[PDB]
Design a protein around this nucleic acid. Structure first.
Ligand SMILES: Nc1nc2c(ncn2[C@H]2C[C@H](O)[C@@H](COP(=O)(O)NP(=O)(O)OP(=O)(O)O)O2)c(=O)[nH]1
Ligand SMILES: [K+]
Ligand SMILES: [Mg+2]
Ligand SMILES: [Mg+2]
Length: 329
DNA sequence: CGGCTTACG
DNA sequence: GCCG
DNA sequence: CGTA
């Protein structure tokens, strides 16, 4: 079992679901407390279990697995022996965890904002609604749409959304394309949002595209919130999606890249978040190359790698290719 | 011990 | 919290 | 700060 998540396939569904869930509770709780190193280790240990070919049934099967030391092994041991881990259950029922989870779910609220509200004594969404002076416009939109945004987006919703985005994109710039990215490209059947990557085959034609796309969608009445409702290339918006006899709010992320950068942008925005962190760490620490969603930089030659495909990028990094479905770290 | 992904809005 |  |  390799030490980096980008060195092994990780399928969406696997054989250690309960164990990985518990470790991810501890990871999440570590993040709420600002302990990013502990979050990383608990996330990595959970991901190792996702990559295993069969269920862990005995403690001895953790021998030699990377990212399993005293703490993560004790969590697994307790789950194997009793079906529950006391530390995990204490986190689950704690007021701090439940409130930080609730608050950071709000679009526009991160750990730092949630933690400040917690320290001020706020605990519920209605507590926030009674203090609208504390809220940015983004947070007001996240708070008002929170119920809809807590409802999973279905794969059957995604096709309808892509067609409406493609219509606006085609008027904004004929020839521009829309590619589904994020969790749905990795094979997920539901999601917290829908992620799209937009480009044009002629380099440079994509300059200035996203404002034109957003104004066309807003004219169609489809945009419940976006940050520009001057030049921008990413938009994190709330969209109006049809439902039977009604509509529901859905989060949609739109990103524009030049076609020269499209393989890097596709790789970055396809995720998973941990897969990409691991891939970028691998690139820098093991290969001495700097990876981001725009390119891959050799800091000694001071040169950028040209890539025509995701396959190119894996080859550059000396990694076996993983299709999106196996990037579910 | 230092390190822990890396951008744009 | 774990790795190198 | 937020988003990814
Ligand atoms: N490098 C990097 N990439 C990131 C980061 N955050 C997001 N991405 C990339 C990788 C992510 O795949 C992509 C957008 O994915 P999401 O919509 O944030 N989540 P997903 O679609 O997996 O699941 P669901 O939506 O159902 O919760 O942006 C980050 O901090 N760093
Ligand atoms: K949030
Ligand atoms: Mg997504
Ligand atoms: Mg997204």
């Amino acid at each position: 079992m390799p030490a980096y998540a980008c060195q092994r396939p990780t399928p969406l569904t696997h054989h250690n679901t309960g164990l990985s869930e518990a470790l991810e509770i501890l990871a999440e709780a570590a993040g709420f407390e600002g302990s990013e190193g502990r979050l990383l280790t608990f996330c990595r240990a959970a991901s190792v279990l996702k990559a295993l070919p069969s269920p862990v049934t005995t403690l001895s099967q953790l021998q030699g697995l990377p990212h399993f030391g005293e703490h993560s092994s004790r969590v697994v041991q307790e789950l194997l022996e009793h079906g529950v881990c006391e530390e995990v259950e204490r986190v689950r029922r704690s007021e701090r965890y439940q409130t930080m989870k609730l608050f950071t779910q709000i679009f526009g609220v991160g750990v730092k904002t949630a933690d400040r509200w917690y320290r001020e004594g706020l605990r519920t969404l209605d507590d926030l609604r009674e203090q609208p002076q504390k809220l940015t416009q983004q947070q007001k939109a996240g708070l008002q749409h929170h119920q809809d945004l807590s409802t999973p987006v279905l794969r059957s919703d995604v096709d309808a959304l892509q067609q409406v985005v493609e219509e606006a994109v085609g008027q904004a710039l004929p020839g521009a394309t829309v590619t589904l990215t994020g969790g749905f490209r990795r094979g997920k059947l539901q999601g917290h949002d829908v992620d799209f990557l937009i480009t044009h085959p002629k380099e440079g034609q994509e300059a200035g595209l996203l404002p034109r796309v957003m104004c066309r969608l807003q004219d169609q009445g489809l945009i419940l919130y976006h940050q520009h409702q001057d030049a921008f290339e990413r938009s994190f918006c709330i969209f109006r999606l049809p439902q039977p006899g009604s509509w529901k709010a859905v989060r949609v992320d739109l990103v524009v890249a030049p076609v020269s950068q499209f393989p890097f942008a596709l790789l970055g925005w396809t995720g998973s978040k941990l897969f990409q962190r691991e891939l970028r760490r691998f690139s820098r620490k093991e290969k001495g190359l700097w990876l981001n969603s725009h390119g891959l930089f050799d800091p000694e030659q001071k040169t950028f790698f040209q890539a025509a495909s995701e396959e190119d990028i894996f080859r550059h990094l000396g990694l076996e290719y993983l299709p999106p479905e196996q990037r579910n770290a």
